[PDB]
Amino acid sequence: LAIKANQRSFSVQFVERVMRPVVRDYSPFDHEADIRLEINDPLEDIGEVADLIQQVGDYMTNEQVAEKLDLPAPEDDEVADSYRSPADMEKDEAGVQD
Amino acid sequence: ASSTPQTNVDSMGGGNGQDLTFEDLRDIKDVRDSGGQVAQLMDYKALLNFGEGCEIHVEGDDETKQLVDGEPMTLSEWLEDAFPHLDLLVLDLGGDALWYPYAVGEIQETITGEFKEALPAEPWTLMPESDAQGKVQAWHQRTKTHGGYQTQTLPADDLWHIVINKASARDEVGISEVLRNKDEIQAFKQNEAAINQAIELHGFPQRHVKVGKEDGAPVRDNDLRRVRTIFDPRTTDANTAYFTGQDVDVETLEAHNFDYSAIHEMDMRNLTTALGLPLEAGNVGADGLGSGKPAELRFALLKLAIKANQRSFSVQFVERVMRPVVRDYSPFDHEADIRLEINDPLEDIGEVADLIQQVGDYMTNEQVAEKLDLPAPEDDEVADSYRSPADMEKDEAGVQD
Amino acid sequence: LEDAFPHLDLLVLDLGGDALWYPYAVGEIQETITGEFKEALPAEPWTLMPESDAQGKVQAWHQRTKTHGGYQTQTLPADDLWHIVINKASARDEVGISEVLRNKDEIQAFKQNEAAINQAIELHGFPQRHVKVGKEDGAPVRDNDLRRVRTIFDPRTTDANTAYFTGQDVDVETLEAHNFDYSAIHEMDMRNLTTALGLPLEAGNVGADGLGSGKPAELRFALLKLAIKANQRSFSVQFVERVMRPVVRDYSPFDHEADIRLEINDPLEDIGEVADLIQQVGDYMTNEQVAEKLDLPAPEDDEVADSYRSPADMEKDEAGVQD
Amino acid sequence: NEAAINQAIELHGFPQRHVKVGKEDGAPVRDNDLRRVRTIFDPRTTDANTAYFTGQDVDVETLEAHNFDYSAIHEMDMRNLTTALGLPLEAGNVGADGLGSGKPAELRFALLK
Amino acid sequence: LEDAFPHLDLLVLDLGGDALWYPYAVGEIQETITGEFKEALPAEPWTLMPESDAQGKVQAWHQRTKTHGGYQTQTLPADDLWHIVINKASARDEVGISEVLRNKDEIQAFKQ
Ligand SMILES: [Mg+2]
Ligand SMILES: [Mg+2]
Ligand SMILES: [Mg+2]
């Protein structure tokens, strides 16, 4: 909680008074865009995340899983937005008698 | 059957404002500013109550949908745009309302038209003036300056104030938990100082050289100066040896053992319990209480206390800062069913996942997404279903399960 | 009623708190500037005392409040006030008992023993230096002589690694820290106070051997839950009967004789234990009964709400094959 | 027995300072002389790290806190009262070895039910 | 932004470290010899102190640095500098608190 409070306080402030001025002054983009910087939790357990994904992956889109699991989102938006696994969808290109 | 409430409210008008002087308020700041163990404990209280962040809900949000910036927003989208860093504001004000009798601030605008922010004010600088029915009718401000102090008064119309700790309903001015416990805080600091001074004197052995024969010739100060020069601990080293006549004795003041650990554990127990924290927050522990139903009770009590503070803050923040912002700067209905809710700091998502495995068959996909702290499904038809969205996708074809 | 009492969770904690401390919680019913119900508004319970008739019913309320001078006094006809009593001597007791006043002697005993320990730690918890000067049966040493010795041996200016050189006729004695079991006195005090206030020992940051385990644990936590249930039911009945029903008469188009219940949540539920139960015997519970135990909204369609097999199982029977 | 323990803790639970003044077999010290010594050694105005400087004919003795097992007296009293009122021992915030386990537990909870 | 801030993981650790030790992390925005953004460039926080207006906003920055003799002094318009405060007394506090100066007494006690 103390780390989260410090991280959010730094992140908001870094975006608002160094990233946004750079987007005004040196960039062809809109500086009013919804930029967030986020700073990683130092004490994550990826095994605890993997356990969670096994228990309730059936309620998470493939992008939500990739986000929690700290991976790039899937290549195709159609599978990224699906709930069932990308491996399960590939396995449904043919496949029989499971 | 009353418009004006017909029951009186114990107003100490003989005490001008409340009996809280600016010096009492500035002494709360002195405790907060000072650092060390007591300040860190009250920071842990703020972080438990408010550090896990927040979410805005509007009951029936979908029906609010309106073209604001020529494009669609519901009131939840508009409020999320209006209060973009609400997690910081909630931790700041929630902190202030735990230390001081209130958090307090003003509503600010852009140079013409739109809402800027809800802007806090330094709570030690401000005290309320109350009417005979206990309502704050004006705010009085004293601030440090180029000279000593400057003084200011404000009509209580564009300020807002949140009270967590209060004596009762009707109490619109609240209580500082610090001033309430000042005697216990003083006791803690005094015992800490007593231990530090006792370690300095008694925690370490000291050399006592005795010179001359007992019932023999007396030794004067100039004689002891030469002996001091020989036995000086400044220039002695670990493996120095001494050669003497029989009439020189190297005695020692032993380190006189006392249980400063138990005194610290006692002090910390007193302070943590006085501040309503569990003993564990003070880096101190107790036997048996770490286990079973004894553990379950104290952590249940902590979560109940947090829940009470969170609800008291959340209701009040909506009713006297979010709703006024919706009247003054917004195209939506201010009478809409807005709720702020502040996250439980001590959730176990593994326990939630275990629950969803056992009884997911009785929860809609939206109820599951809510418990699991995720966005609701994209299509309302699947959101409202009871069987998993992955199972419904699997039923686009699928065979021999 | 949910629209009439939007923040009832806060009101219940406020009044329930007051009715445990004081003999009663007490307050009034308020209206908007014309017409509608505003709120049930509490009043400061230390400021109000009831006047009882010969049959023990409260016939009037008497209020004393601090003011610009000393005190001002007020009297109210007990018609638009309402009051909740949790702790009472019996039925017929319409005025109730303060649990604090009832236990005042034990609270005093606790505070006295606490003060005694703090003073004992200050005097006896820390060793103190005793320098003795002069030879035994020798020349006497006067106060002005001890002032110079005090200046040498001053604990204020001494540091951890100071060394001393003396003639034979100076003795640096010590008052040891004289050991006493203040921890056991605290445990005893806390046991007395918690048991007097009907809380378990564990609430006081104090614990007991064996009592954390097995049937010994189960009994004390059962006793706590029974005491809570008794208070909750006593408050709930009374809140409905003498504030919610009057509001339903005076400001509502509904029947005040309707079967209203307020119920207050159990603080010590284990949702995992409930989920285990639903797995074992869900096959005997309707979907509404499951949703009630599990603390969820009832299903959207009454036909599925009233069914015994899961709503997910019924959805799965919209087609589905080869399970 | 409860009142007796509270009084015993007050008198015997805490150590007390005994300053003895004058030389043994020496000149006597009168009440007005002890009043001035009391003023020097007063526990009311003493603090944790006070130091004392004296001639040889002043002794700072102590009445140690004399150990007695008030916990066992409480456990005995509570066992007496709970059993007299037909409640299990556990109701009084007091416990017993072995009796929390197995058939020994099952009997007392069966009796209660 | 990923192209503009290629080593943000190091910058965040440097500034985040400074903003925990000192009342603020502080720095400037730098450009290539003509046109494009170079980097957000930190500055040594012990060398810089802010000047606050009556409303508590930093209106100028004041800099003292060691040199060939003793010290030289510099002043900057607070327009092209930027500064991050983690530890602060309240909102409105734009100058922040050093956690070290706050705990100096406890640090001295430890070392002694
Ligand atoms: Mg001689
Ligand atoms: Mg003589
Ligand atoms: Mg004589």
Author numbering:
A (entry chain PB): 339 to 436
B (entry chain PC): 31 to 45, 51 to 436
C (entry chain PD): 114 to 436
D (entry chain PE): 226 to 338
E (entry chain PB): 114 to 225
Mind quoting what the paper says about this structure?
Here, we present the near-atomic resolution structure of Haloferax tailed virus 1 (HFTV1), an archaeal virus thriving in extreme salinity. Through single-particle analysis, we obtained near-atomic resolution maps of DNA-filled and empty virions, enabling us to assemble full atomic models of the virus pre- and post-DNA release, including all structural protein components. The full atomic structure revealed that the virus has a length of 1350 Å and an icosahedral head with a diameter of ~600 Å. The tail has a length of 560 Å and terminates into a baseplate with three radiating TFs of ~190 Å in length.
During image processing, we noticed that the sample contained DNA-filled particles as well as those that had already ejected their DNA genomes. The empty structure corresponds to a postinfection state. (C) Cross section of the empty virus, where the dsDNA, tape measure protein, baseplate hub and tail fibers are missing. Instead, a plug-like density appears to cap the portal protein. Comparing the portal structures of the DNA-filled and empty capsid shows that the latter has a plug-like density, which is missing in the former. The structure of the PP itself does not show substantial differences between the two states, indicating that large scale conformational changes in this protein are not required to facilitate DNA release. Moreover, the heads of filled and empty viruses show no notable differences, indicating that DNA release does not lead to any structural changes in the head.
